[PDB]
Design a binder for this molecule. Structure first.
Ligand SMILES: CC1=C[C@@H](OCC#Cc2ccc(C)cc2)CC(C)(C)[C@@]1(O)/C=C/C(C)=C\C(=O)O
Ligand SMILES: CC1=C[C@@H](OCC#Cc2ccc(C)cc2)CC(C)(C)[C@@]1(O)/C=C/C(C)=C\C(=O)O
Lengths: 168, 172
């Protein structure tokens, strides 16, 4: 969880990307993750819409178009590992901002109209550089949030681990 | 993925003896199965090790038991789970350990998380048609309601899936 100084540094980003005017029968949540790695590295993972299995906890595989070149509106077909209440997810790339390090997708099962946004943020103090990733989502209610929270948190933990390994 | 009616028929006595509950108000139960292409001796030797559930449980980082541990009904384990879940630890008591019949089971004895009075039982069953040997693992639990079932089911099914993978790898 973020320190007071980090939360102060992220307030604008939160206000711009992770704050929703919720419609009835939908809830949202915001999660954060500190990563001991440079933002460029974290972003290069986070941005790869075609290969979410590189850091998502439950993805078995991800099929995408042949001759895939990544653009907003493009789709992916995620096959998930066995033991979960769905087997498959078709997902659409909503945002890809390489300048500002912002991405997001929408699902198109229980988590109906799930849409998330992910942002990458640089921090430096005393020559020590690290990253914070924020991820928020909107989802239709059936506490469905507990289940999405767990996936999101787990995905973000593995993001850290993979990024921290690549940074070594 | 889910059992055949032939397997089902072979398992009814086990299900009646070990995986059937007279439920109280504010408690729910569920039964899960898993086909594993490996001998039952190997699967049992994994399932039976109360001190090392991390061998096959999806979300367990580590498990501490007492110094000079020998496995006896009544003994406890302290498990630490990986980050991102709605709890960080669980204290657990060994309820059953029958090596002859291949039955084990445990209770959670601590209570902070939503799964209050979680108690499960696990059985291991042999299968042999045309020199092809395989195993079926049944696991059932009872838990107090606040749908808890979806999360517990998810943990169970995942654990059983990794049990399959681990045992099938050890079968070589
Ligand atoms: C794991 C998973 C399951 C699908 O939804 C059914 C479910 C569930 C579920 C997840 C966690 C827990 C604890 C309980 C139920 C939807 C799915 C897209 C295939 C998902 O990967 C969920 C992915 C999510 C929430 C975010 C992401 O990928 O960035
Ligand atoms: C993985 C795990 C997570 C912890 O809490 C899980 C839960 C829950 C839950 C309940 C209700 C709702 C709505 C959402 C989640 C409890 C825990 C005891 C630490 C556990 O190890 C659960 C382990 C289980 C159920 C079986 C096993 O290991 O054979």
């Amino acid at each position: 969880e973020l320190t007071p100084e980090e939360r102060s540094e992220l307030k604008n980003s939160i206000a711009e990307f992770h704050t929703y005017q919720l419609d009835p029968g939908s809830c949202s949540s915001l999660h954060a993750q500190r990563i001991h790695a440079p933002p460029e590295l974290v972003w290069s993972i986070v941005r790869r819409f075609d290969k979410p299995q590189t850091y998502k906890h439950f993805i078995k595989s991800c099929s995408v178009e042949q001759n895939f070149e990544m653009r907003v509106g493009c789709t992916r077909d995620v096959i998930v590992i066995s033991g979960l209440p769905a087997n498959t997810s078709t997902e659409r790339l909503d945002i890809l901002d390489d300048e500002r390090r912002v991405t997001g997708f929408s699902i198109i099962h229980r988590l109906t109209n799930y849409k998330s946004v992910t942002t990458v943020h640089r921090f430096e103090k005393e020559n020590r550089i690290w990253t914070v990733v924020l991820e928020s989502y909107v989802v239709d209610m059936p506490d469905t949030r507990m289940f999405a929270d767990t996936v999101v948190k787990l995905n973000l933990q593995k993001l850290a681990t993979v990024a921290e390994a690549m940074a070594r």
